């Protein structure tokens, strides 16, 4: 019965789609199992996914389709024909901000499909070409996406050339654009095959199609449309390029027209703009390799004077393609222009460098650029300064800064290698992490700082530098955290992992460790459950740091945090009570939380945060044994909180938190303060001063009952330290003078239950 | 010996079929994932037993630890998809193994009556 269980995995995966944490893990685990099943029973899994995709097609819809298409792509990329062609391929055609993601995903699916399927996708394309000869072009666009090799490219060109004159003008246009991408698809995937082309049937197809496409070009607009393909088709004819460098006359007149259009002598802006696109594509093509270099040398200077002119800016992806190509051709005049200049040039430079890192054996590596690191650092500092001090100009500095941080994520080594310099760089990134108005930048600054904290990076900043800089970052981040906090805290966990790794290979440090300790304790009360769990995880790394340092007080309780909404807060408070030993950190965390809590209390007189802060103060406060005395007096004043909208909730939560969660080491202070307060309810003749006092007494009885019910280990030791006798006598004496009404009877009953 | 592999597998599968404790199931399915990869030619025997519960755990469950073995078994099965059907246990007399070890008379009792009476008549004078 294997088929039946494969279908059960497929059916599980379908029902777990968003359109219909554990469901995330289950979904990914199912997807990964389907992929690994597809590695063998490929058509069962693909059929199921196809069937699901049909059903789904007939925010959560897009996410479901993305999950299905990502699964399909990874299955197809793992492939060791009929329904691929008759069932899947039409659905992938149907797909061809989430629409662009879906188009990208579907294209990756189609690319993967096409690798082993090509003859079928080409048969669909060839059939629509035939239909177009006797206008709906969408199947022709599939040529953009499909995997193409040298033999397949030759076939596509041959099929096209034969039919091209019989096609309608809109179909001819769709073909022209689509073949331009199809050429690039081959060159990018199979650079070795393009290199071999420069080391006659392809050239015959390319020349035939060139002359056909030239015959189509009857107007300025059609000329501008075809020139990017005509340069490709000419690049597919190395021997024609060699002849026209000295039947070919129209190819020479085309290159001359491109030169004239780059040099500004063509009046038509559309032809100059198109000529830029064509000559960038030529420059690009040369990097994947020859006579082509002479053609590049004839146009590159005019192309640079078109795209990189600070006095007359062109009208970014095209400029990036140009700069990357120029760098690959010769690894810097236009580079210095981009370092100096319009912010759009800074943008194009940085994105070009990022592409150079992230995208062949003869291509120059990024390391030639490590002469310009000082200028890149200056550009970063300036851009940072301009983004923070900030409408259209401001928005442009944001996109630039994001790109510079992405560049730092792509490679730190550049910045560090030419060079305080490192401290400035890290400080600037660190300054972005807090910024609420730029979440995308902050996220990337964190990733950048993380890769800057990997071993190989730190060496380039060693140990005396690591300590100073990394602690300064920690101290600053923690100081902000104690003033997207959750994501910053996750990242701070991975930074601590990196620090532990760096020390395992091995005054601001004490300050940083203390502020970190403060921050982590302050996260234990945070209203976000995820934040609390992450903070717990951070104590593990604080312990690991100390193990690594010491191997050359709280540690047991930190390891218990590491081992771990209302249930979690209860568990946290139970652990906080087990902190016996004072530290600068825990003390300061208590004082800061107390200060915040007093401010929040005034504002209240957000509630769940105040409850959690209250609980934390109650649980940790023993370490501080004054500020604690004042907090306890304030809690006692809140037991009788008369506030109309939040008073019941305040009284209930103070009662429950004092009664279940207070530190055992504070019981001696609590009983003295309760005693002293209740004693004020009597005059000098020992008569009872009878609503506030009655309410205090009821809450006191419940609080004391809850304390005495509690079996927290070590609580017995502290219960002994202060006498209850005068307090309990005063409680019963107070309750005796309450009349025989229902509420007073309940209070008498509760006091009996306390006494028991 | 494939009979010993089949018996071992059938016992583990029997223990999965019935036990309600998810912690038992973690241990057992981890051993079935290795055992499937180890004894792939014999593994088909157990498939009938596993089929009902594996459908149930795939469609229902949300523990990754238990699912990791289950997905491993399905992958292993498909990867090696036979030389021994469920009938193979019947040939040597074990088709009842998963039968009997399920949850809690006449036909069995009459044979036991004859057996006990024969036990007495052989052993007791």
Among A9, A22, A37, the residue with its CB nearest the CB of B62 is: A22
- Tell the residue number behind the tokens 């004239």, with chain if given: A260
Report resolution in angstroms.
6.2
Find the residue in B nearest to A33 (Cα): B71
**Quick check: helix, strand or coil at residue A168?**
coil
3-state secondary structure of A544: helix
Distance between CA atoms of A304 and A298, rounded to whole angstroms? 12
CA-wise closest residue to A674 among A725, A735, A749, A713 = A725
Q: What is the DSSP letter of A504?
A: H
- Give residue for tokens 């005396």: A464
Please indicate whether, in this complex, the C-beta atoms of B74 and A6 are within 8 angstroms of each other. Answer: yes
Interatomic CA distance for residues A124 and A109, integer angstroms: 17
Q: Give, as one character, the DSSP assignment of residue A670.
A: H
Give me the torsion for CA of A409, A413, A414, A419, rounded to 10°: 130
Burial class (CB in 10 A: 0-12, 13-18, 19+), A77: middle
The encoded tokens of residue A684 equal 């000098």
Q: Buried (b) or exposed (e) across A550-577, using 16+ Cβ within 10 A?
A: eeeebeebbebbbeeeeeebeebbebbb
Closest CA to A273 of A235, A314, A313: A314
- Give the span between the Cα atoms of A390 and A386, in whole angstroms: 6
Taking an 8 Å cut-off on Cβ atoms, the answer to whether B47 and A1 are in contact is: yes
The C-alpha atoms of residue A9 and residue A231 are separated, in whole angstroms, by 50
First CA to last CA distance, chain B: 42
H or E element, residue A549: helix A529-551
Sign of the torsion angle spanned by Cα atoms A574, A580, A584, A590: positive
* Euclidean distance between CA atoms A517 and A539, whole angstroms: 8
Sign of the Cα torsion A178, A181, A187, A188 reads: negative
Buried/exposed A614-640: b ≥16 CB within 10 Å, e otherwise: bbbbbbbbbbbeeebeebbebbbebbb
Instruction: Return d(Cα A108, Cα A76) in angstroms, integer.
Output: 10
Query: Which residue's entry shows tokens 């490709």?
Result: A232
A598 membership: H or E segment, kind and range: helix A584-604
Given B47, B71, B81, which is nearest A33 (Cβ)? B71
Residue A686 φ/ψ region, left for φ over 0, alpha for ψ in the -120 to 50 degree band, beta for the rest = left
**Alpha carbon distance A737, A720 (integer Å):** 30
Closest CA to A679 of A668, A666, A667, A689: A689
How many whole angstroms separate alpha carbon A433 and alpha carbon A480? 9
Q: Residue A125 and residue A96: Cα distance in Å, rounded?
A: 14
Of B59, B67, B77, the CB nearest to A2: B77
Q: Which of A574, A571, A590, A594 is nearest to A582 (CA)?
A: A590
Report phi then psi at A407, rounded to 5.
-60, -45
Specify which residues A682 forms β-bridges with.
A688
Distance CA A445, CA A469 (A): 16
* Burial zone of A524 (CB within 10 Å; 0-12 exposed, 13-18 middle, 19+ buried): buried
Residues in chain A whose Cβ is within 8 Å of chain B? 1-2, 4-6, 8-9, 11-12, 15, 22-23, 25-26, 29-30, 32-33, 36-37, 39-41
Chain CA centroid to CA A162, Å: 49
Residues forming a β-bridge with A688: A682
Question: Taking the CA of residue A529 as centre, how many other CA atoms within 13 Å lie in the half-sphere pointing to its CB?
Answer: 8
Using the Cβ of B21 and the Cβ atoms of chain A, whether some distance falls under 8 Å is answered with: no
DSSP assignment of A703-721, as one string? HHHHHHH---TTHHHHHTT
Reference A598, options A633, A622, A624, A639; nearest CA is A633
**CB pairs < 8 Å spanning A and B:** 60
Identify whether the C-beta of residue A147 lies closer than 8 Å to the C-beta of residue A115. yes
- Which stretches of chain B are assigned E, i.e. beta strand? none
Question: Which residues, including other chains, have CB under 8 Å from residue A295's CB and lie 6 or more apart?
Answer: A241, A245, A255, A282, A286
Q: Do A40 and B75 touch (CB under 8 A)?
A: yes
Supply angle C-alpha A169, A122, A162, rounded to 5. 45
**Which residues of chain B are within 8 Å of residue A5 when distances are taken between CB atoms?**
51, 54-55, 58, 74, 77
SS3 A688: strand
Residues of B in contact with A40 (CB under 8 A): 75, 78-79, 81
H helical segments located in B19-63? 22-38, 44-60
Task: Determine contact: B20 vs chain A, CB below 8 A.
Answer: no
Are A5 and B71 an interchain contact pair (Cβ–Cβ within 8 Å)?
A: no
- Three state DSSP letters for A508-537: HHHHHHHHHHHHHHHHHCCCCHHHHHHHHH
Phi, psi of B84 (to 5 degrees): -145, 105
Q: What is the spatial distance between Cα A355 and Cα A449, in angstroms, rounded to a whole number?
A: 20
Q: How far apart are CA A388 and CA A403, in angstroms?
A: 15
| Interface residue B65 vs chain A (CB under 8 A) | no
Check: CB of residue A449 under 8 Å from CB of residue A474.
no
The nearest CA of chain B is from the CA of A39 a distance in Å of: 8
> What is the spatial distance between Cα A452 and Cα A467, in angstroms, rounded to a whole number?
14
For chain B, give the residues followed by a break (C–N over 2.5 Å). 81, 104
């Amino acid at each position: 019965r294997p088929v039946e269980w494969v279908q059960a995995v497929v059916s599980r995966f379908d029902e777990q789609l968003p359109i219909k944490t554990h469901t995330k893990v289950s979904t990914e685990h199912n997807k990964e199992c389907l992929i690994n099943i597809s590695k063998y029973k490929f058509s069962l899994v693909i059929s199921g996914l196809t069937t699901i995709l049909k059903n789904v097609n007939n925010k959560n819809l897009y996410l479901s389709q993305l999950i299905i298409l990502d699964t399909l792509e990874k299955c197809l990329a793992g492939q060791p024909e009929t329904m691929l062609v008759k069932q899947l391929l039409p659905e992938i055609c149907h797909f061809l901000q989430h629409a662009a993601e879906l188009r990208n995903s579907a294209s990756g699916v189609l690319f993967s499909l096409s690798c082993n399927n090509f003859n079928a996708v080409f048969s669909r394309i060839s059939t629509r070409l035939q239909e177009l000869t006797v206008v709906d072009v969408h199947d022709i666009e599939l040529l953009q996406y499909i995997n193409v090799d040298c033999a397949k490219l030759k076939r596509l060109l041959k099929e096209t050339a034969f039919k091209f004159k019989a096609l309608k003008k809109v179909a001819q246009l769709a073909v022209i654009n689509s073949l331009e991408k199809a050429f690039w698809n081959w060159v990018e995937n199979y650079p070795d095959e393009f290199t071999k082309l420069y080391q006659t049937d392809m050239a015959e197809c390319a020349e035939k199609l060139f002359d056909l496409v030239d015959g189509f070009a009857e107007s300025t607009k059609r000329k501008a449309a075809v020139w990017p393909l005509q340069i490709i088709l000419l690049i597919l004819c190395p021997e024609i390029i060699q002849d026209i460098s000295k039947n070919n006359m129209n190819k020479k007149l085309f290159l001359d027209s491109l030169r004239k259009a780059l040099a500004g002598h063509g009046g038509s802006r559309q032809l100059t703009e198109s000529a830029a696109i064509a000559c960038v594509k030529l420059c690009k093509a040369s990097t994947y390799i020859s006579v082509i270099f002479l053609l590049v040398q004839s146009m590159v200077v005019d192309l640079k004077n078109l795209l990189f002119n600070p006095s007359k800016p062109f009208s970014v992806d095209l400029m990036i393609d140009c700069l990357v190509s120029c760098f690959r051709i010769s690894p810097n005049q236009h580079f210095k222009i981009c370092l100096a200049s319009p912010s759009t040039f800074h943008y194009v430079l940085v994105n070009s460098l990022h592409r150079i890192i992230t995208n062949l054996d003869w291509w120059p590596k990024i390391d030639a650029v490590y002469c310009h690191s000082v200028e890149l650092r200056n550009m970063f500092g300036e851009t940072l300064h301009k983004a923070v001090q900030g409408d259209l100009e401001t928005r442009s500095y944001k996109y630039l800064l994001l790109s510079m941080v992405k560049l730092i994520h792509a490679d730190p080594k550049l910045l560090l290698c030419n060079p305080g310099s490192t401290a400035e760089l890290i400080t600037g990134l660190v300054q972005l992490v807090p910024q609420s108005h730029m979440p995308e930048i902050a996220q990337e600054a964190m990733e950048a700082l993380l890769v800057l904290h990997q071993l190989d990076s730190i060496d380039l900043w060693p140990v005396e530098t690591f300590w100073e800089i990394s602690s300064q970052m920690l101290f600053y981040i923690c100081k902000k955290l104690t003033s997207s906090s959750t994501e910053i805290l996750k990242w701070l966990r991975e930074i601590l992992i990196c620090r532990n790794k760096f020390l395992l290979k091995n005054p601001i440090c004490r300050q940083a460790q203390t502020k970190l300790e403060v921050a982590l304790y302050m996260f234990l009360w945070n209203p976000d459950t995820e934040a609390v769990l992450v903070a717990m995880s951070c104590f593990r790394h604080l312990c690991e740091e100390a193990d690594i340092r010491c191997g050359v007080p709280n540690y047991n309780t930190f390891m218990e945090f590491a081992s771990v909404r209302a249930a979690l807060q209860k568990r946290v408070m139970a652990l906080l009570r087990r902190i016996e030993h004072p530290t600068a950190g825990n003390t300061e965390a208590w004082e800061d939380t107390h200060a915040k809590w007093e401010q929040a209390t005034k504002l209240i007189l957000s509630l769940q945060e105040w409850i959690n802060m209250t609980g934390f103060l109650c649980a940790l406060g023993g370490v501080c044994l004054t500020p604690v005395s004042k907090f306890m007096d304030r809690l006692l004043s809140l037991m009788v909180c008369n506030h109309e909208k939040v008073g019941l909730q305040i009284r209930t939560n103070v009662k429950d938190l004092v009664g279940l969660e207070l530190s055992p080491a504070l019981y001696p202070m609590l009983f003295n303060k309760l005693k002293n307060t209740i004693s004020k309810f009597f005059d000098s003749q020992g008569q009872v001063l009878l609503d506030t006092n009655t309410q205090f007494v009821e809450q006191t009885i419940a609080i004391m009952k809850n304390l005495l019910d509690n079996h927290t280990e070590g609580s017995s030791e502290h219960l002994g330290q202060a006498s209850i006798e005068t307090m309990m006598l005063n409680l019963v004496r107070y309750v005796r003078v309450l009349g025989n009404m229902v509420h007073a009877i309940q209070i008498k009953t509760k006091l009996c239950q306390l006494v028991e | 010996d494939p009979k010993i592999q089949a018996l071992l597998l059938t016992v583990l599968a029997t223990l999965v079929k019935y036990t309600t404790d998810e912690f038992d199931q973690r241990i057992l399915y981890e051993y079935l994932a290795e055992a499937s990869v180890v004894f792939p030619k014999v593994f088909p025997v157990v498939h009938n037993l596993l089929d009902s519960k594996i459908n149930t755990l795939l469609s229902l469950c949300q523990d990754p630890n238990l699912l990791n073995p289950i997905h491993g078994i399905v992958q292993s099965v498909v990867y090696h998809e036979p030389q021994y059907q469920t009938s193979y246990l019947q040939s040597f007399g074990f088709n009842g193994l998963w039968r009997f070890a399920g949850p809690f008379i006449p036909d069995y009792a009459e044979l036991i009556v004859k057996f006990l009476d024969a036990l007495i008549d052989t052993y007791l004078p």
